[PDB]
Amino acid sequence: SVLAAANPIYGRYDDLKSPGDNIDFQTTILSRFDMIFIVKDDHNEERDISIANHVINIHTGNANAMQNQQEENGSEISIEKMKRYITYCRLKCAPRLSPQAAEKLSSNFVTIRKQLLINELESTERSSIPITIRQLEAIIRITESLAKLELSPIAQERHVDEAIRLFQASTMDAASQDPSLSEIRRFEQELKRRLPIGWSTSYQTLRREFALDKALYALEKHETIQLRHQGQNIYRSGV
Amino acid sequence: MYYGISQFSEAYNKILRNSSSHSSCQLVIFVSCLNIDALCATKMLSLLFKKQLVQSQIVPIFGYSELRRHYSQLDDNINSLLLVGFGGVIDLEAFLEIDPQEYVIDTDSGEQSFRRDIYVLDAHRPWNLDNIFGSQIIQCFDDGTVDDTLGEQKEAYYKLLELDRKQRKKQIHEYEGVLEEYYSQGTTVVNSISAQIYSLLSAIGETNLSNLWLNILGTTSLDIAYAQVYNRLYPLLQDEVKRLTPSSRNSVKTPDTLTLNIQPDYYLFLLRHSSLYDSFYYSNYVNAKLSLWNENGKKRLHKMFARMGIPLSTAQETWLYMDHSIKRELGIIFDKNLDRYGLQDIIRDGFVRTLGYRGSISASEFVEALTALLEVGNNSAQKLTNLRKRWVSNFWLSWDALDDRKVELLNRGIQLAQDLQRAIFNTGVAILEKKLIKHLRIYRLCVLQDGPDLDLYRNPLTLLRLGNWLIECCAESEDKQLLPMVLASIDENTDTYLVAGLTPRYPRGLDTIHTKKPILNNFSMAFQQITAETDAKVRIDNFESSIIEIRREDLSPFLEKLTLSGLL
Amino acid sequence: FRKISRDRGIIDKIISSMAPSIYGHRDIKTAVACSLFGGVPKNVNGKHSIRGDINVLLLGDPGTAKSQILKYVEKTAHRAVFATGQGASAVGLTAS
Amino acid sequence: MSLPAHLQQTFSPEEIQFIVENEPIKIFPRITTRQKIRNHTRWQLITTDDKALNNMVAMRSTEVVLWIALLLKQQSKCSIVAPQWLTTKELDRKIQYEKTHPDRFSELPWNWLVLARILFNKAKDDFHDPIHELRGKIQDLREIRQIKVLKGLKYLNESHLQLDNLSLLEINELRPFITEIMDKLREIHTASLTA
Numbered sequence A: 001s002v003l004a005a006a007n008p009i010y011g012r013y014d015d016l017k018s019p020g021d022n023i024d025f026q027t028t029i030l031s032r033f034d035m036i037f038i039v040k041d042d043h044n045e046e047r048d049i050s051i052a053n054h055v056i057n058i059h060t061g062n063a064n065a066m067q068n069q070q071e072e073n074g075s076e077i078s079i080e081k082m083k084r085y086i087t088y089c090r091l092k093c094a095p096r097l098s099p100q101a102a103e104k105l106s107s108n109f110v111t112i113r114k115q116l117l118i119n120e121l122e123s124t125e126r127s128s129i130p131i132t133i134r135q136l137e138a139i140i141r142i143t144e145s146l147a148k149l150e151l152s153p154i155a156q157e158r159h160v161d162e163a164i165r166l167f168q169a170s171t172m173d174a175a176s177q178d179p180s181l182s183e184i185r186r187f188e189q190e191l192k193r194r195l196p197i198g199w200s201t202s203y204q205t206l207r208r209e210f211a212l213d214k215a216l217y218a219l220e221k222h223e224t225i226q227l228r229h230q231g232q233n234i235y236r237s238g239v
Numbered sequence B: 001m002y003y004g005i006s007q008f009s010e011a012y013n014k015i016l017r018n019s020s021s022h023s024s025c026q027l028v029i030f031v032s033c034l035n036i037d038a039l040c041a042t043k044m045l046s047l048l049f050k051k052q053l054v055q056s057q058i059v060p061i062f063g064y065s066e067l068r069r070h071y072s073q074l075d076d077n078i079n080s081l082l083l084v085g086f087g088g089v090i091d092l093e094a095f096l097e098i099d100p101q102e103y104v105i106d107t108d109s110g111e112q113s114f115r116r117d118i119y120v121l122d123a124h125r126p127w128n129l130d131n132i133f134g135s136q137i138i139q140c141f142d143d144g145t146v147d148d149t150l151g152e153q154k155e156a157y158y159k160l161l162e163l164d165r166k167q168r169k170k171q172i173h174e175y176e177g178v179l180e181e182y183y184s185q186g187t188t189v190v191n192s193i194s195a196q197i198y199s200l201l202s203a204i205g206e207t208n209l210s211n212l213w214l215n216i217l218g219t220t221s222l223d224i225a226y227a228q229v230y231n232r233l234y235p236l237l238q239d240e241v242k243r244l245t246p247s248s249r250n251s252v253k254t255p256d257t258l259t260l261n262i263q264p265d266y267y268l269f270l271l272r273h274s275s276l277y278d279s280f281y282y283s284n285y286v287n288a289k290l291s292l293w294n295e296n297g298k299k300r301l302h303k304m305f306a307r308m309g310i311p312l313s314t315a316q317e318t319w320l321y322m323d324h325s326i327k328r329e330l331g332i333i334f335d336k337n338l339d340r341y342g343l344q345d346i347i348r349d350g351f352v353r354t355l356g357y358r359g360s361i362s363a364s365e366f367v368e369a370l371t372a373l374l375e376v377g378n379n380s381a382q383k384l385t386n387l388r389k390r391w392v393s394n395f396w397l398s399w400d401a402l403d404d405r406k407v408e409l410l411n412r413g414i415q416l417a418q419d420l421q422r423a424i425f426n427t428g429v430a431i432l433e434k435k436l437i438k439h440l441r442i443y444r445l446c447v448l449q450d451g452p453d454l455d456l457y458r459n460p461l462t463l464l465r466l467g468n469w470l471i472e473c474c475a476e477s478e479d480k481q482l483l484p485m486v487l488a489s490i491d492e493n494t495d496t497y498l499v500a501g502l503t504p505r506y507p508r509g510l511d512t513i514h515t516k517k518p519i520l521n522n523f524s525m526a527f528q529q530i531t532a533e534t535d536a537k538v539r540i541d542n543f544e545s546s547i548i549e550i551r552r553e554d555l556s557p558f559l560e561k562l563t564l565s566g567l568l
Numbered sequence C: 001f002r003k004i005s006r007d008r009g010i011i012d013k014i015i016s017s018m019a020p021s022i023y024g025h026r027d028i029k030t031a032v033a034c035s036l037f038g039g040v041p042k043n044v045n046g047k048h049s050i051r052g053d054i055n056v057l058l059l060g061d062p063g064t065a066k067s068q069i070l071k072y073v074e075k076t077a078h079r080a081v082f083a084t085g086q087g088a089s090a091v092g093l094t095a096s
Numbered sequence D: 001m002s003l004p005a006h007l008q009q010t011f012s013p014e015e016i017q018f019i020v021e022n023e024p025i026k027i028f029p030r031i032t033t034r035q036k037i038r039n040h041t042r043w044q045l046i047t048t049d050d051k052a053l054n055n056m057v058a059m060r061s062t063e064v065v066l067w068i069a070l071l072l073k074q075q076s077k078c079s080i081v082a083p084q085w086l087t088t089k090e091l092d093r094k095i096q097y098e099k100t101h102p103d104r105f106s107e108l109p110w111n112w113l114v115l116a117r118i119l120f121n122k123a124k125d126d127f128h129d130p131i132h133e134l135r136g137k138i139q140d141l142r143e144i145r146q147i148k149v150l151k152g153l154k155y156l157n158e159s160h161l162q163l164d165n166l167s168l169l170e171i172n173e174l175r176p177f178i179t180e181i182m183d184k185l186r187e188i189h190t191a192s193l194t195a
């Protein structure tokens, strides 16, 4: 198994640039990897305080006590024990999918490929992160590993649901990164002038007015509108 | 006196008559955990009652609150109670709410009998005169102090008891002064409970090698803080070892022979279970005599090892695998090259027990292993109870360590002892480098506010271990005059401190007239007096009287009032 | 060493004594002194390892004694190696 | 079901010890229950003879059931006398017999292993011979008898087998193998002889 750590060009991700510009790896090499994690520096104050307080505890000797206490509490496993457990699981269990699990995996692979197709059609450019049959086998392998760690001879739908969640959190997240313009500007101007600052309009009405309408999501980023009633109501948040 | 030395057999026979019924379990033994002497005494009692098939229950109690709660929970069928390691310094009938009229049966005919007998069994000398003299339910296993050194107190107590003009009032105040001067005395220890129970066994005739070994362990538990007591009791153990060892000496070793021996047992730290270098380095006495805490101490140690001609590679080798040339010349080498550094007191005679082919072990090492197992074996008023629960649980680990079939637990205890001594050394060098001990004209305070592994010191035994380290270091410094020391350790989870008022002691091996008079720990009365007024959420429940748990915010005013208190 | 370390303001003396024949640049001297003394390399439980050495980057206009400070550090430090610009390949910097 | 799987057709070694503990043994009492001519509770048991228990005289050898001898030896109230076969001379004689006749077992009592273990554990100080030598000879006898068994389990036919002089614990530990291999070699034979 290959666990490879890389770095996008320019060091930082630079989400202003296209997702294909940050990653210099070819599609062929990127297709082998089952899960392609793209982590980012959130620069969130509440998370930064937590990270700082954790790192300081690491430095000021507090780790040698806290980790030992957690391990003896039973919420952790020492390296010498996890290594033996991993060897035992690998030499004892090789789970195979149940038919209900296989139906879920197929119906999810179709959804994933449809989403990739619509993203490619919208962007009119092949996605840098590929989704192929090798990724269906990747989800199969993740499901079987999740079942294996429990020594379950057959992989239920719980493992399929968790494997699907893991794939969505890693490779779909990597592939979903996004950077016409005249239509976006027209939509923003017309809804700013028509829909007042303090009121709300329903989305079916905006559809009648008319697309994918990513302009509404962009405005939601700018905190000028807000979809509240389960997406059925578009409310001008006050900007 | 209540029960002298010569009449322990009377108490044992009374216990047998009252509660040696196979129908039920009418005997309950209350043992104070965090006390090796009480642990060995209770092991002796357990073996003795196993021989006579006397059903009994052994309860480890940590504090006085637990004792009161258990006694309240105690059923009325249980007609024999043993308190091991505590109860001799408090008004037990008052503390437990005991009135003799509700426990008396068959009052008639100059005799009295009671439906429950409480036998207190401890070594702390401030005997409560209402226990040793003015109560029949409470029966104290005296060691001969009361019948010889409490005549004046006996007369003073009885005169006031019987008497309920100017001459009468003056004499009452004179007698009441005798009682008062008897109190306001620090709590010391004169004897070992293990030796007392071994004397009882000698009276009954159940002595054997295992009981003698438990006696040796209990006595050697006192050598660190009460070396005068250990030196007093040592000749008796030396005679007993000679008496019990079989005449078939110099025989070949067989996988069944158990040998108690009196051989040179140097006063190092786990010498046989760790390297020679680590035995010197982590020894309390060597540290005091060389000041290894500073940087120059390690250089002094290396220079000493070079002087003896022991290579550092050989010195750091594990004691089992040390070359037989060096290991067989330790006595000669130590004779030649120890008086130079003032470590002549390192050479000593101790007891070493070998069980067949399992290798030697000395009582000094065994008690360190037992202590380690007691200490680290496994919103605010609840987590503390969880700590008490774990502390009670560790008592059974230390108890099972005594069995010869659980050597795999004694080895774990040895490893824990080495780790705890390492942690104690690290915290000691951290305290002595930052100069945390604030010198005063009353008591040298020292508060642990922050650092590593500070959760080790919420245990009273580990805190006492660190305090003994510091006190040994200070005792060998001539400039530093003798003065009580205070240690505190903040518990972050409960936001409470653990103040442990200690006592100073003279340098080991220094025998003088003032050394003969023991030093008395006056912190108990001071703590109780300060807590009685000025409510400060102080928890005075430990059998070790000079240890309290105080709130984080209330610590400083408490220490201020203690400074204003001239009791100690 | 132990006698002069107890002095108040020993850090300022040490900093001021880095490049004695180079005027000003107290921030650079402070950074170089910190790098020369270094930090403590941690190792948590034998699994997590934290770097314990301080890296310094001197970026500035020409003729500001950046190379002279480097030459001084080479003179002072115990084990020092000097490599420059294009005259240092990838495998000669690390291992070949 | 009512009887666990590991207790189906064999005896657990605890049950073998239980069976052995019912055999009489000779003891030297440290008490005296013999009522004098000039109260007291008598044993009056129902699965053995109480006559030798109500008439114990200190240091006068009697015979009591083993599980009672052990009960008294729990205190210091008796002293179990080792059987004559449990001495170094007799063990050496039996070892010589085993080394001399490689086709048949020696005539050790059926409970020799169980009795040796029980007496070594509970009566370790009642042997006229050093126990460190009795253990070393018991182990030697066990090793020789194990060598002879492994060379006779090479004769597991489908008709029968004569394991003469074999002990009870050895038979108990060999039962699930011998009695389940011979069953299969018998099923094969009966299947062949279906004509």
Ligand SMILES: Nc1ncnc2c1ncn2[C@@H]1O[C@H](COP(=O)(O)OP(=O)(O)O)[C@@H](O)[C@H]1O
Residues within 6 Å of the ligand: C021, C022, C023, C024, C025, C061, C062, C063, C064, C065, C066, C067, C068
């Ligand atoms: N602050 C300063 N004090 C003394 N000399 C300086 C100073 N700054 C620069 N110099 C002189 O400038 C000369 C050239 O410096 P150089 O090593 O070329 O710096 P750089 O490589 O950054 O251009 C040196 O001989 C040095 O003596």
Ligand SMILES: [Mg+2]
Residues within 6 Å of the ligand: C066, C067
């Ligand atoms: Mg330059």
